[PDB]
Design an enzyme around this catalytic site. Structure first.
Site, PDB file in Angstrom:
ATOM      1  N   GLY A 157      15.237  51.942  28.073  1.00  0.00           N
ATOM      2  CA  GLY A 157      15.231  51.668  26.644  1.00  0.00           C
ATOM      3  C   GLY A 157      16.010  52.735  25.927  1.00  0.00           C
ATOM      4  O   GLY A 157      16.226  53.804  26.486  1.00  0.00           O
ATOM      5  N   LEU A 158      16.442  52.465  24.703  1.00  0.00           N
ATOM      6  CA  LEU A 158      17.158  53.468  23.921  1.00  0.00           C
ATOM      7  C   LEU A 158      16.445  53.777  22.637  1.00  0.00           C
ATOM      8  O   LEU A 158      15.946  52.873  21.970  1.00  0.00           O
ATOM      9  CB  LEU A 158      18.515  52.970  23.542  1.00  0.00           C
ATOM     10  CG  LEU A 158      19.550  53.043  24.618  1.00  0.00           C
ATOM     11  CD1 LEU A 158      19.950  51.634  25.037  1.00  0.00           C
ATOM     12  CD2 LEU A 158      20.720  53.823  24.058  1.00  0.00           C
ATOM     13  N   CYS A 173       3.999  53.596  31.400  1.00  0.00           N
ATOM     14  CA  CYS A 173       5.175  52.779  31.639  1.00  0.00           C
ATOM     15  C   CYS A 173       4.845  51.402  31.248  1.00  0.00           C
ATOM     16  O   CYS A 173       3.979  50.798  31.840  1.00  0.00           O
ATOM     17  CB  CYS A 173       5.558  52.787  33.108  1.00  0.00           C
ATOM     18  SG  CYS A 173       7.016  51.835  33.476  1.00  0.00           S
ATOM     19  N   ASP A 209       9.764  52.048  11.418  1.00  0.00           N
ATOM     20  CA  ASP A 209      10.739  51.471  12.297  1.00  0.00           C
ATOM     21  C   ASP A 209      10.058  50.494  13.231  1.00  0.00           C
ATOM     22  O   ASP A 209      10.389  50.399  14.420  1.00  0.00           O
ATOM     23  CB  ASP A 209      11.452  52.547  13.102  1.00  0.00           C
ATOM     24  CG  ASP A 209      12.706  52.029  13.788  1.00  0.00           C
ATOM     25  OD1 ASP A 209      13.513  51.353  13.114  1.00  0.00           O
ATOM     26  OD2 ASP A 209      12.888  52.304  15.000  1.00  0.00           O
TER      27      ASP A 209
HETATM   28  O1  LIG Z   1      10.237  55.687  22.265  1.00  0.00           O
HETATM   29  C1  LIG Z   1      10.961  54.731  22.539  1.00  0.00           C
HETATM   30  N1  LIG Z   1      12.066  54.473  21.718  1.00  0.00           N
HETATM   31  C2  LIG Z   1      13.056  53.403  21.987  1.00  0.00           C
HETATM   32  C3  LIG Z   1      12.486  52.269  22.840  1.00  0.00           C
HETATM   33  C4  LIG Z   1      11.494  52.814  23.867  1.00  0.00           C
HETATM   34  N2  LIG Z   1      11.094  52.264  25.010  1.00  0.00           N
HETATM   35  C5  LIG Z   1      10.104  52.996  25.519  1.00  0.00           C
HETATM   36  C6  LIG Z   1       9.417  52.722  26.700  1.00  0.00           C
HETATM   37  C7  LIG Z   1       8.233  53.382  27.005  1.00  0.00           C
HETATM   38  C8  LIG Z   1       7.515  53.017  28.139  1.00  0.00           C
HETATM   39  N3  LIG Z   1       7.955  52.053  28.930  1.00  0.00           N
HETATM   40  C9  LIG Z   1       9.095  51.384  28.687  1.00  0.00           C
HETATM   41  C10 LIG Z   1       9.482  50.375  29.570  1.00  0.00           C
HETATM   42  C11 LIG Z   1       8.990  50.358  30.873  1.00  0.00           C
HETATM   43  N4  LIG Z   1       9.285  49.378  31.711  1.00  0.00           N
HETATM   44  C12 LIG Z   1      10.072  48.353  31.357  1.00  0.00           C
HETATM   45  C13 LIG Z   1      10.375  47.351  32.275  1.00  0.00           C
HETATM   46  C14 LIG Z   1      11.214  46.306  31.908  1.00  0.00           C
HETATM   47  C15 LIG Z   1      11.746  46.251  30.622  1.00  0.00           C
HETATM   48  C16 LIG Z   1      11.441  47.250  29.703  1.00  0.00           C
HETATM   49  C17 LIG Z   1      10.607  48.301  30.074  1.00  0.00           C
HETATM   50  C18 LIG Z   1      10.308  49.324  29.179  1.00  0.00           C
HETATM   51  C19 LIG Z   1       9.847  51.715  27.561  1.00  0.00           C
HETATM   52  C20 LIG Z   1       9.885  54.021  24.696  1.00  0.00           C
HETATM   53  C21 LIG Z   1      10.728  53.950  23.667  1.00  0.00           C
END
Ligand SMILES: O=C1NCCc2[nH]c(-c3ccnc(-c4cnc5ccccc5c4)c3)cc21
EC number: 2.7.11.1
Length: 283
Positions: free
Chosen positions: A26-27, A95, A139
């Site tokens: 993720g971004l 996660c 946001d």
């Molecule tokens: O703080 C953030 N800002 C931008 C978007 C983001 N994604 C996350 C995040 C946190 C925990 N897990 C994920 C994540 C884990 N596993 C995935 C599997 C498949 C697709 C997306 C996933 C996102 C993303 C955090 C943040």
């Protein structure tokens, strides 16, 4: 008399403890998010890296404070390490492998008014917790709402405190900017999309700004032919253009459509079809 622990920043190299991969999950507003594994456990986690400064000390600070809520993504540990002679805050969070919210939705074989109600309510609970301790998220968007797992009963969690900001006769116990109303609007946009598969403010784009400023949206048929007036009326009080005219997270949580998710019609919406049928310009 309820007190939770404070934040203990770890200083050992974070690799002592996790295998860090380069798969991007993720971004963020100010850091990407890699997948990592607990070397001692093989279990998976998400790691967000930020250059220590104060904008970042805040994200950590605020997010840690909010991490208690069930509907906010939990912070597992925070490391302060050196990375290329620069000092870094590394946030390790649970996660969320279940995907973003609108994606679980866009992947089925029908979505019900009731399910929407249920989803809105969990997002609502996140916001309500945040506002109750004076944090505006600033946001809330679809990309920031992830499911904890693919299992059908997984939990929806809110992420990214990149813009989260503190906020401090109720107007005598401390002033307070429109900072929160910002979230109530987001909340209205998401609810809108949830019910019909497209956003209330369209592009076609100097005119999108203006339809947003003017408050120009409709509840077009078919997608909405089936949806309650009661509901449209709710959406309407969220999407009010005057921040102060806008509904508050408390009124929202008490509104019946939310309060009683199960008393809500299982009526089907077009959302899932429209979400596939538009996968393209969904950017
Ligand atoms: O703080 C953030 N800002 C931008 C978007 C983001 N994604 C996350 C995040 C946190 C925990 N897990 C994920 C994540 C884990 N596993 C995935 C599997 C498949 C697709 C997306 C996933 C996102 C993303 C955090 C943040």
């Amino acid at each position: 008399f309820h007190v939770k622990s404070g934040l203990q920043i770890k200083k050992n190299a974070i690799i002592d403890d996790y295998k860090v991969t380069s798969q991007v999950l993720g971004l963020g507003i100010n850091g990407k998010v890699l997948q990592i594994f607990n070397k001692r456990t093989q279990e998976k986690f998400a790691l967000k890296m930020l250059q220590d400064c104060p904008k970042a000390r805040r994200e950590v600070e605020l997010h840690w404070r909010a991490s208690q809520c069930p509907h906010i993504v939990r912070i597992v540990d925070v490391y302060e390490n050196l990375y290329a002679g620069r000092k870094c805050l590394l946030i390790v969070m649970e996660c969320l492998d279940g995907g973003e919210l609108f994606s679980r939705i866009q992947d089925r074989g029908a979505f019900t008014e009731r399910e929407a109600s249920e989803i809105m309510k969990s997002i609502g609970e996140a916001i309500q917790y945040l506002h109750s301790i004076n944090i505006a998220h600033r946001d809330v968007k679809p990309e920031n709402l992830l499911y904890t797992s693919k299992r059908p009963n997984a939990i929806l969690k809110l992420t990214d405190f990149g813009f989260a900001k503190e906020t401090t006769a109720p107007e005598v116990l401390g002033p307070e900017k429109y900072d929160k109303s910002c979230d109530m609007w987001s909340l209205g946009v998401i609810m809108y999309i949830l019910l019909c598969g497209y956003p209330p403010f369209y592009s076609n784009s100097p005119g999108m700004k203006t339809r947003i400023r003017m408050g120009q949206y409709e509840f077009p048929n078919p997608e909405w032919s089936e949806v309650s007036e009661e509901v449209k009326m709710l959406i309407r009080n969220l999407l009010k253009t005057e921040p102060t005219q806008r509904m508050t997270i408390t009124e929202f949580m008490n509104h019946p459509w939310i309060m009683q998710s199960t008393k809500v019609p299982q009526t089907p919406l077009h959302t899932s079809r429209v979400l596939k049928e538009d996968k393209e310009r969904w950017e």
